[PDB]
Amino acid sequence: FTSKDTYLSHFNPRDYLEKYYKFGHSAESQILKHLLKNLFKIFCLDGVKGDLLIDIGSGPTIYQLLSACESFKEIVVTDYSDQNLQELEKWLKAAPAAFDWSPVVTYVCDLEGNRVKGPEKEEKLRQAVKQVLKCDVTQSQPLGAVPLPPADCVLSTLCLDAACPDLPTYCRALRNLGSLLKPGGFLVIMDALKSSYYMIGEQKFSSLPLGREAVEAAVKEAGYTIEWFEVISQSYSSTMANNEGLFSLVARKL
Ligand SMILES: C[S@@+](CC[C@H](N)C(=O)[O-])C[C@H]1O[C@@H](n2cnc3c(N)ncnc32)[C@H](O)[C@@H]1O
Ligand SMILES: COc1cccc2c(=O)ccoc12
């Protein structure tokens, strides 16, 4: 299985964004649309809200925070890769080399009923993100020495399957994310099903191939109660990954 040090050195953030999030009718854009609709449902319709949301394994992406910034005063973004956090920071600071998220932002504005336009939505997200932190989900203290208040919600999109080499580590990671959550707080996970790798160009990265039953069992083992669980059949392009759909779940910490 891919060593975690490979993420520091070989995960190219700009290449990842170009391959998966350009949003130019690709499998990658169909998956992105589905993820955005579910995140809108959770944070805007279901009213998952609070003072603090921690996004775990954010990579260099912000799409997973666009609806969340309407419901949370503060968002903390985290990743194992320092290069990924620097790419995020380019967008947060509105630096010239920042990735163009405007088609994704417009799509979320449309989903939300065109209450606001792209620039207002972006400013709301930029104001919500106060901290950009290193994290390691495999550790009992994922945020290391950095203290944070217990969060109202922990979100993790397409991270846990890449971070966990086996099922015991995956259950342990759910427990470690739980240490960041307030009692009764929400856990929101979205990831690929039955995927054993993903590609960024010629660079291969391992993935833990879990089925829906093993994911649900691990969340219950780790001390959560599931509110809803959805499986989609849509898979990534054959050149990208070997998954059999994706899942999304919302649970509460016991
Ligand atoms: C496939 S990307 C998902 C990125 C983003 N959340 C998205 O939805 O596109 C996997 C992310 O997991 C991060 N990662 C890998 N191992 C990790 C670990 N042990 N702890 C935290 N993050 C880790 C990588 O650095 C990378 O940003
Ligand atoms: C967009 O990122 C991905 C694309 C496809 C598959 C995976 C995976 O199996 C684990 C982590 O990330 C993935």
Curated annotation (Swiss-Prot):
Residues where N6-acetyllysine is found: 33
Pathway: Cofactor metabolism; Amino-acid degradation
MF GO annotations: nicotinamide N-methyltransferase activity; pyridine N-methyltransferase activity
Family the entry assigns: Belongs to the class I-like SAM-binding methyltransferase superfamily. NNMT/PNMT/TEMT family.
GO cellular component: cytosol
Broad class of enzyme this protein falls into: transferase
Domain of life: Eukaryota
Extra information: Prominently expressed in the stroma of high-grade serous carcinomas. In tumorigenesis, regulates the epigenetic reprograming of cancer cells associated with increased cell migration and metastasis.
Effect of residue 126 to K: Loss of N-methyltransferase activity like its citrullinated counterpart
Subcellular location: Cytoplasm
Regulation of its activity: Inactivated by deimination on Arg-126.
Tissue: Predominantly expressed in the liver. A lower expression is seen in the kidney, lung, skeletal muscle, placenta and heart. Not detected in the brain or pancreas.
Function noted in UniProt: Catalyzes the N-methylation of nicotinamide using the universal methyl donor S-adenosyl-L-methionine to form N1-methylnicotinamide and S-adenosyl-L-homocysteine, a predominant nicotinamide/vitamin B3 clearance pathway. Plays a central role in regulating cellular methylation potential, by consuming S-adenosyl-L-methionine and limiting its availability for other methyltransferases. Actively mediates genome-wide epigenetic and transcriptional changes through hypomethylation of repressive chromatin marks, such as H3K27me3.
Post-translational modification: Deiminated by PADI1 and PADI2.
Pfam name, any one: NNMT_PNMT_TEMT
Catalytic activity: nicotinamide + S-adenosyl-L-methionine = 1-methylnicotinamide + S-adenosyl-L-homocysteine
PROSITE patterns reported for this sequence: NNMT_PNMT_TEMT, SAM_MT_NNMT_PNMT_TEMT
Residues that coordinate or bind S-adenosyl-L-methionine: 16, 21, 57, 63, 79, 84, 136-137, 157
Protein name: Nicotinamide N-methyltransferase
Effect caused by changing residue 191 to A: Loss of N-methyltransferase activity
Upper lineage: Eukaryota, Metazoa, Chordata, Craniata, Vertebrata
